[PDB]
Amino acid sequence: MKVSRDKDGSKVTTVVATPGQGPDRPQEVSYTDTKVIGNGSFGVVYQAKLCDSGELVAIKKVLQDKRFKNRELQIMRKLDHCNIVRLRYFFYSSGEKKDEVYLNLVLDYVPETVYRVARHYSRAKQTLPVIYVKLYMYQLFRSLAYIHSFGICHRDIKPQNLLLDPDTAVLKLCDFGSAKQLVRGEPNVSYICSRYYRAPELIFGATDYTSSIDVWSAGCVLAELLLGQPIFPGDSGVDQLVEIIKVLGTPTREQIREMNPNYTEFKFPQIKAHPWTKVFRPRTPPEAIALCSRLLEYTPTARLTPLEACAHSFFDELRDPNVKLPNGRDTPALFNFTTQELSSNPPLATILIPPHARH
Amino acid sequence: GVEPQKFAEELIHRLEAVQRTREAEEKLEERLKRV
Numbered sequence: 260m261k262v263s264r265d266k267d268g269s270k271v272t273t274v275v276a277t278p279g280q281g282p283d284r285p286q287e288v289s290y291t292d293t294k295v296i297g298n299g300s301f302g303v304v305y306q307a308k309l310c311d312s313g314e315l316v317a318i319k320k321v322l323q324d325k326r327f328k329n330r331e332l333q334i335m336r337k338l339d340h341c342n343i344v345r346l347r348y349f350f351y352s353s354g355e356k357k358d359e360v361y362l363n364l365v366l367d368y369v370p371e372t373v374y375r376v377a378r379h380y381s382r383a384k385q386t387l388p389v390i391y392v393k394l395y396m397y398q399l400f401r402s403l404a405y406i407h408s409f410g411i412c413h414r415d416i417k418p419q420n421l422l423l424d425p426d427t428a429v430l431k432l433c434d435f436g437s438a439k440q441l442v443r444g445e446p447n448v449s450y451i452c453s454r455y456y457r458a459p460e461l462i463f464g465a466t467d468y469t470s471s472i473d474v475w476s477a478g479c480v481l482a483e484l485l486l487g488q489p490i491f492p493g494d495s496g497v498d499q500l501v502e503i504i505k506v507l508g509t510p511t512r513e514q515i516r517e518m519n520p521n522y523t524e525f526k527f528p529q530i531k532a533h534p535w536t537k538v539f540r541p542r543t544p545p546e547a548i549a550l551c552s553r554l555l556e557y558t559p560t561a562r563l564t565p566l567e568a569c570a571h572s573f574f575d576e577l578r579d580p581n582v583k584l585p586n587g588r589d590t591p592a593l594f595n596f597t598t599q600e601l602s603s604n605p606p607l608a609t610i611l612i613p614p615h616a617r618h
Numbered sequence: 619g620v621e622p623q624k625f626a627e628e629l630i631h632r633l634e635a636v637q638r639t640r641e642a643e644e645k646l647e648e649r650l651k652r653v
């Protein structure tokens with residue numbers, strides 16, 4: 260890390276960095292105009308301007324620990340999808356204190372998140388227009404179909420981790436700091452995922468869960484977009500399960516068995532469910548409620564797969580050849596599916612790819 | 619998490635609390651409508 264001042268007097272940072280994709284050959288990377296854009300207990304997120312191209316980038320600086328167990332760099336080097344934020348470069352750096360080593364992820368910059376836009380609408384006592392709910396959820400389910408095809412489970416699906424370009428309506432999944440390639444028979448830590456979005460089998464302590472925990476989290480995101488606030492606001496891990504049961508009713512013995520078989524014998528109090536049509540506002544579109552009911556299932560194998568979710572009738576308007584964004588410009592890329600993306604259910608492409616986009 | 623026997627007891631206790639709150643809620647409706 261060397262530093263220079265160019266014309267206009269800005270502070271220029273120059274490093275040697277490895278490309279996120281392609282051959283392992285380090286290159287000089289120079290950027291300027293750095294400012295703090297995000298925060299964590301173990302790092303910082305910056306915006307910067309690449310000197311050669313002038314493009315805005317994001318730099319995620321994550322403190323390195325031996326016991327940290329972070330698969331983020333390894334996963335990001337492998338991923339290449341229009342709904343996942345691209346790793347341009349990565350490099351290591353040292354902080355001001357001794358033995359303070361940081362991994363630096365130079366990412367494509369995206370100006371907003373689904374959380375901030377939803378909060379902005381919520382603060383104005385308004386709901387996000389349904390076309391954006393369809394567009395955002397569709398692209399999220401698309402990105403989950405991609406990573407799940409590699410066995411990779413995000414494990415932290417939430418609105419803050421959904422990057423958003425409001426001009427184009429493009430969504431990009433980010434924050435792979437909890438992501439893992441799930442291997443059958445190898446246990447996974449059950450205290451994972453942010454509390455409001457945490458699947459019930461995780462709260463039950465299941466270590467043999469699958470990538471369907473992301474679909475539960477996506478259901479929470481969709482419900483939050485319809486409601487204007489989180490649907491399951493737990494005060495704690497056990498309270499989170501209580502908040503879920505307050506809406507969905509007490510899980511049956513067979514649903515408990517599918518979440519964690521160690522609990523099948525317990526007689527839990529029968530909490531009457533709220534009907535789905537009473538959970539949301541009266542004018543909430545009925546297909547949004549229906550799709551949400553197929554994501555927020557206790558039994559994980561009963562949840563829709565991300566490819567099935569993309570084919571749900573709630574997204575039919577996206578497949579209409581006349582569909583366009585409300586501002587006037589046409590929708591982002593939606594039907595350029597790859598073989599890797601469709602590998603879970605290859606026959607579904609005849610539904611996911613309408614004739615006008617097959618052309 | 620933890621021992622399932624311990625977690626199930628805590629969950630049962632909290633869910634019983636939910637039932638009591640909901641039952642008290644409807645009784646409060648009846649008391650208010652009686653006024």
Ligand SMILES: Nc1ncnc2c1ncn2[C@@H]1O[C@H](COP(=O)(O)OP(=O)(O)O)[C@@H](O)[C@H]1O
Nearest residue numbers: 297298299304317344366367368369419433434
């Ligand atoms: N590529 C990016 N472009 C623009 N902003 C980003 C990017 N990556 C992250 N951010 C912002 O910084 C926040 C934190 O980064 P993220 O890796 O998602 O989670 P964490 O806080 O755990 O690092 C995100 O919620 C987002 O608001």
Ligand SMILES: [Cl-]
Nearest residue numbers: 298417419420
């Ligand atoms: Cl956050």
Ligand SMILES: [Cl-]
Nearest residue numbers: 410441442443
């Ligand atoms: Cl496997």
Ligand SMILES: [Cl-]
Nearest residue numbers: 512516523524
């Ligand atoms: Cl049995």
Ligand SMILES: [Cl-]
Nearest residue numbers: 527528529530
């Ligand atoms: Cl009961």
Ligand SMILES: [Cl-]
Nearest residue numbers: 507555556557
């Ligand atoms: Cl259910």
Ligand SMILES: [Cl-]
Nearest residue numbers: 620624625628
């Ligand atoms: Cl205790």
Ligand SMILES: [Cl-]
Nearest residue numbers: 646647650651
């Ligand atoms: Cl009243």
Ligand SMILES: [Mg+2]
Nearest residue numbers: 419420433434
């Ligand atoms: Mg995050």
